[model samples]
Target: PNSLDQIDLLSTKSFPPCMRQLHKALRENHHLRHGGRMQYGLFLKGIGLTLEQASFNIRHSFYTPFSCLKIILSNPPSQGDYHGCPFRHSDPELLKQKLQSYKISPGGISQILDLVKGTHYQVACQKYFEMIHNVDDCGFSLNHPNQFFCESQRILNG
Candidate 1:
């Protein structure tokens, strides 16, 4: 039901911003920092990425997918690291740039930034998901990054 090729397709089609960013970094650099490996590796696991496929990418702790709270409070990324939630970790300017690249409208970007400014990182991410998926409401409270992926797949597959 899963393969590297499918994972590659899902990265853009269904992954949340954090996992998508990590996937992009891995593709560009051919390696991810340990932080990225753990974060993204666990997420892939939740989505059915197997040990064999993971060997090609990057973990086996029976670890659950990281929740928004965990990623927001976990070790912050330093230079050259691509782990953690963008709404929580990225600079506002950089976040704006990324949102722009994602093609969010300026007004929508402002609303998302407002949520970010309020320190509602998960809410901001929810907004991002809504905007990207073109939904008025995402229909679920987003807690885990893998939840974002699943809901995205549900919407996309529907």
Candidate 2:
């Protein structure tokens, strides 16, 4: 079914920040640490790739997608690792710069930053999804990275 093609397309359009940053890092470095690979690998599996296909792309065996709690409590990424939630791990300045690069409005970025400062990582991500899609609300509770991908596709395709 050419699932890889769909993944490539969705990588930009639907991937959450955690997975999106990993995908970009993989593209630029042609490699990911074990943490990054595992995190992103399971996400691909959740999004519809067969086990073999997901393994082929990430060169790793995998499993069910991780929820925000799992990722937030996972091994803290060391230098050069891009596996953890950016909202939880990234410095405020760096996150702001990344949001600005995405052209998120100053007011919107401030709101996201405040959410992140409150340690509401998943909510911050939900806000990001709403901002990017121009929706006042995403209309679903977001728990896992895969959910973000599905919701983004639903919005884009409808």
Candidate 3:
């Protein structure tokens, strides 16, 4: 209903458990994994994040799964059992090169790196939101991840 002040994630089902699973995975792998790649990428892919979001997360040099997945897979994918998520998003090494190819200065990847290292994904998401929403303080477009839509309160002090 329009009366609802808050929207639920993934339609209120699988939402809570998914959040728990993500936090658990992130805490365990966030540092040890490839620049949070294994943790965030799989979680995003597991929850069916669009190739757009996944590609966008690479910061730049956005690769389309339709075009790049099989090619990327020919090398190797992230080391996890997250299932069929396409090697394109799994490899932080490739993602980093992709970003560098786009000439990311301290402005782009650095901010993302600091935020992720600090485990401040909420702030990070907000920053990403701003980029795609790039208007005069424009509102969010559709198909931003359900997690990105979650307000700070919705994230439950995490």
Runs in model 2 deviating more than 4 A are 1-9, 50-62
Best candidate according to TM-score: 1
Deviation in Å, model 3, residue 139 alpha carbon: 7.0
lDDT (CA) for every model shown?
A: 0.82, 0.82, 0.35
Candidate 1 C-alpha lDDT tens digits along 72-109 = 89879999899999999999999999989978999889
Error of 1 at 157 (Å): 1.7
Clashing pairs in 1: none
How many Å off is the CA of 61 in candidate 1?
14
Instruction: Give the TM-score (vs. native) of candidate 1.
Output: 0.88
The positional error of residue 130 in candidate 3, measured at the CA in angstroms, is 1.6
Candidate 2 C-alpha lDDT tens digits along 7-125: 55567678998988887787667778889878987787686564233423432233567888899987789998989999999998999998898779998899999999899989999
TM-score of each: 0.88, 0.87, 0.29
Give one digit per residue, the lDDT tens place, for model 3 in 43-109: 3454445213221322222222211123223334346532222212334455345345434444655
Residue 5 of model 2, lDDT score: 37
